[PDB]
Every structure is written in C-alpha cells, then in structure tokens.
C-alpha cells in the first residue's frame, strides 16, 4: 500500500518507499538495445547501443522512459504499480506537455491509483527542513539555481546551466590524458569517475592553489589503478570541479555557479533576498566536492552587500536530498489531499496534473 | 469587507462581497482622461475579454474604487476576474498593479466562467458565457476549467448591436448606436424555430413593436427582433464562418473525457448579458438535444440574474470560509512578487 518515490535524473534513477530515509534502488538512467535497463545495460554495453532518455533533467525519449519506469516498479522495487500511489519528480521549468505525458503514462500504462509530480529542488529544500531558501542543485546533466518561497519555485528567477557531473568527468579524463595517462575504454571512464569522486576538491582560491601546486608536491594524491599501478594526481584534483565556477574551462560562455546564484537572488524581490542568502541549500551529487561549500560562501560574500548574513547549507546526504524530500512529503498527513487520483484522471484527463502540480 | 470587481469588454461590474448584486455597473471605456459614462479618442482597454491597454485599465480601476464604490483600496481584500485562457503575464500584471498601485491588503483572480458555475451552486458543469466582446464554452471539473476543451468565439453583444443596426438600415432607417443597443436589449428574442418564425412574422399581431426614439420619432421593429440574436446560432449572418453557440457547446463537451460528459450535459449553465434573450434557453435545449445521444439527460440552467452571474459567483466565493486561505496577501506579494499569483490562482 505504501507510496513510492521515484526521482528520475539525467544519470541516475533513485527509487524507493515513502517514509524510508534513503532510496532502495539507485541505478543508471540508461536503456540499451543491440532491451536492457540500468545496471544490466551497462554490464552488456558491448552488444548494446546505449541511450539516456533524460537530457539535462528533461525527459526526451518517452519510449525508453517507460522502460525505465517499468524496470523501476517490477525489477527494482518488485511491486505492482496499481497498488501504490507514486510520487515522481521533475526539473524546474519542465514543459507542460511533459507533465501531462508523465501523468498519462502513469495512469494509463502503469495504472497507478494516484500520483503526484514535485519539483526536484523544492523537495531538496523540504529535506533540509525549510520551505523558503535558494537551492543549488547539481547532478549528472544539469545545474539549477532555484529560489523558493513557501514551497513555490519562483519561475522568473530560476537559472539553468547545462554543465554538471558528466561534463566534469569528461574534463578530468581530458586533463588526466594530457598528463600522460590513458583513459579511453568505457571501463577506463569508470576509473576517472572514481578518481573524480574520491580525490577532487574545490579550491578556495584557484590561482593561488595553482601556484601552490606548481611550487611543491603538497597538494598531490596517489591513486591505485585496478592493475596495481599507482598514479599521482596533482592540480587536476581542483582544476576539474573549478569548471563549475569557470565554465570557460570547457568552452562554455556561461557564468559560473556562484554568479548564477547571485543573479538568481537579484531576480527576486528585495524583501526575500535576506532569507535566500541565509538559506543557500546545496543538493545533488556534483555538490559533494570537499571545499565547495566554503568556496561558495567566499564567492557569495564577495558579491553580496557587506552587511548580508550568508549561510551555505550542505547536508551530508545531499546526493539523495531530492529523493528524501519526496519520501518526507509523501508521508505527510497534509499531503494526502494533494494526490491526483485515478478517479480524477478518468474525469479530467492528463491536464488534471495542472490542478495539483 | 471584500470587494468584487468583474471587468468585461463592455462593462465593469463592481461591488461588495456578500451583496446579491453589483452596486456599480459602467462602460469599460477610457477617453483622451475620461472614464465610463462621462467619456476625445475612445478606447476599450479590454478586447475579447483580455486586458490589452494597462494604462487605461488603471484608469478604470481607479474610477471603480474611488468614483464608483467610494472606498479606500488599501482597506479591502479585492477579488478580480479574468477570462478563460488569460495569458500568465496578464494575471501577473493585474496582481502587480493591485498591490503596487492600489496597495490592497490582499487579492485573488478567479476565472469568470468558474464563478458563474459557483453562482448556480455547482462545481462541475459547462458554462456558456457570452458578453459584449467574447463568447466562451468552459467545461469545468470540481472548480477546474478544462484547458484543452475551452472554446472561444469572438462573436458577442457588440456584434449583435452592429448587426441590428445593419438590418434596420436595410429597411430605410439611418444610424445612434447606443439607441440600437437599447432596442436590442428591450425588444429582441430568440425564435424557437427560426425559419418558421420568419415565414409567419407577417401574420403575427404580436411581433411588431414600436420604439420611441429620444427626439420623439416612433419607429417599428418586426422580424429584426429575432433575426438579430439568431446570429448566435448562425454566425454566417455576419459573414463569420464559425459554428453557432449550440455547436460550440457540443464540440466543447466532445473534447472532454466520456466519464464527465453526462455531468456536463446535465449542468449547462448560461452566463452573461448576451444570454439574456427571451427564448434562448429553450432554443439551446432543442439544439443541444438534437446533437447529443438520445439517452443523455440535458439541462440548461439560465438564472434570471445571469447578466451578473460572474459577479455574483465572486461575491459568493469571497464570502466562503474555505476561501480565506486562498487570498494572496500583501506580505506574500512583497516576498515573491507578481508570480505568486500562480501559487494560489
């Protein structure tokens, strides 16, 4: 009977049961054809063509997305969809047709008794115990700045940057190859992602850190490859996530995440800015770098009025903050009226989703 | 005390929540400034139900608050109305002006057809709303207007007035528009069987009516009485290629899911000044029944006060205890800005 929470991202699906403190299942948002989904597709990627049905947070391939949802319900969670209200998540500024399509598939294809669609960043805010603040959400495919007032994401101030964890992995691959190492096969890409997640960090002052990496071995770390070779990682440790603050590193002409944060706040009314500055919540896998909260604090402090109280909140579980916020929301007694029911769907159709979501 | 202001293409209807009728009704016109009766270039700031001239709309709202209602806006929560499918930016601008120009303590924007439905005591049904500038068919499920099934027809009261002018001219009269509008409202009616009414009009002792013009001339109107609103059912009368209001009603219902159609058919609510013609309900009953399945129960609801149904629905909504949470407050506006209207409306 328990409500399901399914958080669909560009790189990973997080799925589980409302009321749990973590998703039961986390797996790659991939569909492979010579069909296979998730883990069983990346372990067979030799005989398979791989596709990502979600690009930059947006569903773009509905056929493959149904396969993902099918895999989630039956293979991963082992439930009959018709027995479980299902909460889904979506990107900020998701096109209306997409929300209607998601609703149509849930009710007509999977026959869920009830459903709801929530904005991912809003769920992250909820997980931190807040209903007002500004979320920096950075995953595998997209980064957003999302200011939120009493659970409402302020649409004119939402910022989107199409640079996230996948780009950082690609960039680390490139600069490690420049240092003489070799990372080309898909198995070698997994090594680079492991290095990224284990050894990278965000420098407090990039240029000083570069200068420090150049005059001594003090910033260096060793990493043992699968075959037992030990390699040394130097300024690549912080050059890789520096891309978030300087998108020009990969040729992108956008402002970095500190400036888009500031720009987002400045697109909000003056009365709320004080609360946003004091409630910067970081969400997503790509906000996990050591040093990133402290760097953001420094950069926002430099942009904001000198009298402004600035606070960056970086929960330890923020890889799963979106999912956890969904788990919380779907557990609240005040939320149960908010479900869209199959009965309502029978009457109003897919556009009923705009009445409640 | 909450205010209710229902802004139309031709008329502003304004008053106090809890009253059974608007206290102020006046022309939605600005002349250059002059507003309403006292209005130069004439302009209608609302066209086919949509606000298109914001400077003039502020002049209208100013005239409404101070000159007509004699109130201080900052003391009253204000409910405004909007057309079906009103662009998001327009709803935000209305909100911005109410808070920043008139400093209301609270506000709300409701869809006009939905308010009309509420005024008839229902939350599910289909509304035919026909005013001065636009006609809509709006199917509604539990207070939610179904966006894919809404129909808009730019044929309404102003066009009928123009047409009455045209066909009276055919018989030798010369036009003066305000006079013809008055003739329309007092003497026109919808024939149950148009062709039969046309054929028999010469032998009816009841159909000719005299109308005393202001300067004192007595003129006679015959079959123009029912030819004028026949245009609603036959838009070809004015060279328009749309189906008539019976067919747009049917088409709107057919864009809704089959599960709700019985409830739509049984809850056909007519709203607006241009639905006031004697005979229009029975003509609709006939025409919709001819299109619908024979097993379908059809009911046309046409309240005597339906000229003001939108306003009355607003008066009711703004008086409900379950609605008080729905108001957008000055504090919320101060934090979130104009887009806050999408959270609550």
């Amino acid at each position: 009977t328990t409500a399901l929470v399914c958080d669909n991202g560009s790189g990973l699906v997080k799925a589980g049961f409302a009321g749990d403190d973590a998703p039961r299942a986390v797996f790659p948002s991939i569909v492979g054809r010579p069909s296979y989904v998730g883990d069983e597709a990346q372990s067979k990627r030799g005989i398979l063509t791989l596709k990502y049905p979600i690009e930059h947070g947006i569903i773009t391939n509905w056929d493959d997305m149904e396969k993902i949802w099918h895999h989630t319900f039956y293979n991963e969670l082992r439930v009959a969809p018709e027995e479980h209200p299902t909460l889904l998540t979506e990107a900020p500024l998701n096109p209306k047709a997409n929300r209607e399509k998601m609703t149509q598939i849930m009710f007509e294809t999977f026959n869920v008794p009830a459903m709801y669609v929530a904005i991912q960043a809003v769920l992250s805010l909820y997980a931190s115990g807040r209903t007002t603040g500004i979320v920096l959400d950075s995953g595998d495919g997209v980064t957003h700045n999302v200011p939120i007032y009493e659970g409402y994401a302020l649409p004119h101030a939402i910022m989107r940057l199409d640079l996230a964890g996948r780009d950082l992995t690609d960039y680390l691959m490139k600069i490690l190859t420049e240092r003489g190492y070799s990372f080309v096969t898909t198995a070698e890409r997994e090594i680079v992602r492991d290095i990224k997640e284990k050894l990278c960090y965000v420098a407090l002052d990039f240029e000083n850190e570069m200068a420090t990496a150049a005059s001594s071995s003090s910033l260096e770390k060793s990493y043992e490859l699968p075959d037992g070779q030990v390699i040394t990682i130097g300024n690549e440790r912080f050059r890789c996530p520096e891309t978030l603050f300087q998108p020009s590193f990969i040729g992108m002409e956008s402002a970095g995440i500190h400036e888009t944060t500031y720009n987002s706040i400045m697109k909000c009314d003056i009365d709320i800015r004080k609360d946003l500055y004091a409630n910067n919540v970081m969400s997503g896998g790509t906000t996990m770098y050591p040093g990133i909260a402290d760097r953001m604090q420094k950069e926002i402090t430099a942009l904001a009025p000198s009298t402004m109280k600035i606070k960056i909140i970086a929960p330890p579980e923020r890889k799963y903050s979106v999912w956890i916020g969904g788990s919380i929301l779907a557990s609240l007694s005040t939320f149960q009226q908010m479900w869209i029911t199959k009965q309502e769907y029978d009457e109003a159709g897919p556009s009923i989703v705009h009445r409640k979501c | 005390t909450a205010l209710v202001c229902d802004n139309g293409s031709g008329l502003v209807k304004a008053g106090f929540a809890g009253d059974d009728a608007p206290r102020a009704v006046f022309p939605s016109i600005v002349g250059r400034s002059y507003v309403g009766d006292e209005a130069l270039t004439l302009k209608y700031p609302i066209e086919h139900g949509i606000i298109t001239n914001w400077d003039d709309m502020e002049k209208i709202w100013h005239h409404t608050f101070y000159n007509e209602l004699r109130v201080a806006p900052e003391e009253h929560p204000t409910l405004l109305t909007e057309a079906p499918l009103n662009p998001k930016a327009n709803r935000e601008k209305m909100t911005q002006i109410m808070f920043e120009t008139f400093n209301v303590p609270a506000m709300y924007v409701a869809i006009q057809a939905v308010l009309s439905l509420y005024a008839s005591g229902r939350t599910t049904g289909i509304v035919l709303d026909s005013g001065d500038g636009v006609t809509h068919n709006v199917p509604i499920y539990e207070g939610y207007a179904l966006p894919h099934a809404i129909m808009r027809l730019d044929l309404a009261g102003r066009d009928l007035t123009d047409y009455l002018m045209k066909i009276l001219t055919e018989r030798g009269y010369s036009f003066e528009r305000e006079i013809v509008r008055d003739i329309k409202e007092k003497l026109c009616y919808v024939a149950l069987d148009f062709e039969n009414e046309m054929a028999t009009a010469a032998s009816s002792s009841s159909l000719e009516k005299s109308y005393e013009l202001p300067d004192g001339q007595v003129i006679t109107i015959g079959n123009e009485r029912f030819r004028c609103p026949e245009t609603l059912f036959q838009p070809s009368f004015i060279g328009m290629e749309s189906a008539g209001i019976h067919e747009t009603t049917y088409n709107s219902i057919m864009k809704c899911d089959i599960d709700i159609r019985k409830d739509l058919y049984a809850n056909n609510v007519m709203s607006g000044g241009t639905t006031m013609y004697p005979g229009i309900a029975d003509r609709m009953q006939k025409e919709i029944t001819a299109l619908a399945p024979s097993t379908m129960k059809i009911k046309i609801i046409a309240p005597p006060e339906r000229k003001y149904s939108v306003w009355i629905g607003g008066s009711i909504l703004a008086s409900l205890s379950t609605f008080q949470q729905m108001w957008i407050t000055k504090q919320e506006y101060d934090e979130a800005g104009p887009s806050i209207v999408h959270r609550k409306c």
């Binding site: 009321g19 749990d20 403190d21 039961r24 797996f27 115990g129 209903t131 609240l332 005040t334 | -």
Partner: peptide
C-alpha cells in the same frame, strides 16, 4: 465545494523517524 500548516508540517518534521533501509547501488 460543499459550501458552494502544510508548510509547518515540513518545517517541524523529524527525519530521525524515517526508516533505515539498505540502498542498492553499483
């Protein structure tokens, strides 16, 4: 319709009451 708090529950929610569960991820 017959006649014709939400945020506080979030702000005061106790996350320690959420169930521990094992996350499967490769």
């Amino acid at each position: 319709m017959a006649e014709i708090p939400d945020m506080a529950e979030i702000e005061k929610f106790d996350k320690s009451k959420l169930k521990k569960t094992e996350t499967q991820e490769k």
